[model samples]
Target: VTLQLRIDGMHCKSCVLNIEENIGQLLGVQSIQVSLENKTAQVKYDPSCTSPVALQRAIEALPPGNFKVSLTCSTTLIAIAGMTCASCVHSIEGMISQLEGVQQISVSLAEGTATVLYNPAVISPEELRAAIEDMGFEASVV
Candidate 1:
């Protein structure tokens, strides 16, 4: 099956390439294309062993947000503001990753967006916002 996700928080070509590499590494994933300009990814995979949820899980497992996988076919984009410097970005990324249910996180400095793929069972958007705020950044679900 093939699924298209309108991802947010991509700033550069490297970001797209990073996401594509991460998604392509998953067990059942066949291919992935991420575009920095559109901030989205198209993933082709086998549904027999892996579903859209698994792909989400892989995205969540990335550094920074470290979000957990709770569901499939769920897409969310969060806006994050009030970053002081590049270090802040790294800090927030590492902080959110420690959360229990966090699956993966991608923070873009250019767009000021955080793309998180996580399991609702393990965490909630509210909690994610709180985590971001706790670290001195403001986050809102879009």
Candidate 2:
């Protein structure tokens, strides 16, 4: 199904990338496309495997007052380093997202960034860095 939500805090390409990467990694998510220009996302997902409420919760987790979602499926991107291969990628992907506020995370071998969507109240950029570092990679929010 295609799902979309209005994003109030997006301001750049990085923000678009951040949101796209986060939502694209969900278990039942088939694809996610976000337009910073439009401030929305067209998501292809399986509702049976996941719920919109889960997506809403994830969107609310990003830094305070930075973003608001009218519906669900709010996303963001982050940068992470030290991944060497698919295993390294898989390891970090599996672990980093399990953190309290993280909705999802995708580690790119080519870009060397971990795109993450999380609730800011439960975690912040600082906490995000620590979680990635714990996975043996240097993580920073940009």
Candidate 3:
């Protein structure tokens, strides 16, 4: 899984390297980079045994006074059809999350609504809707 997260409380190079050493120890972390200038950590890791939440917790527990992690998402809602159970939510969320420019995705099993926070410049709402449709579920713009 590739992740881009915001980090707060970094002031210098040590603060930057601190995050690298801390998050680098996790199970599937790879090619970690923490930019003190940007206050962000871009990481690539396996989603199989690890997750964003885990990494966030690890970082927030580190640093001098600890740091803040922004693993959350953005905004867009696409109504989905044909989800039978809870897996549908994860399945859709996981799929959409892989797309570049997709900052965040929230999928609902109860409403079959998939809301996403994506970069409009990279992927439009129409294109995102098509992605869900191609996943074998009904999709409509919201």
Model 2: lDDT equals 0.70
Give Cα-based local distance difference scores for all models. 0.70, 0.70, 0.75
| Preferred candidate (TM-score higher): 2 or 3 | 3
Listed in order, each prediction's TM-score against the native is 0.46, 0.44, 0.46
Residue-level lDDT for 5 in candidate 3 = 83
lDDT of 3 at 67: 64
C-alpha-based local distance difference test score of model 3 = 0.75
How many clashes in candidate 3? 1
**TM-score-best of 1 and 2:** 1
**What is candidate 1's local distance difference test score?**
0.70
lDDT of 3 by residue, 49-123 (tens): 778787777667776566666783447788877789898877888887886989878888776677777886677
Instruction: Provide the RMSD of all predictions against the true structure, rounded to 1 decimal.
Output: 19.6, 19.6, 17.0
After TM-score superposition, the amount by which residue 110's alpha carbon in candidate 2 deviates from its true location, in angstroms, is 1.1
Q: Which stretches of candidate 3 lie over 4 Å from their true place?
A: 1-74
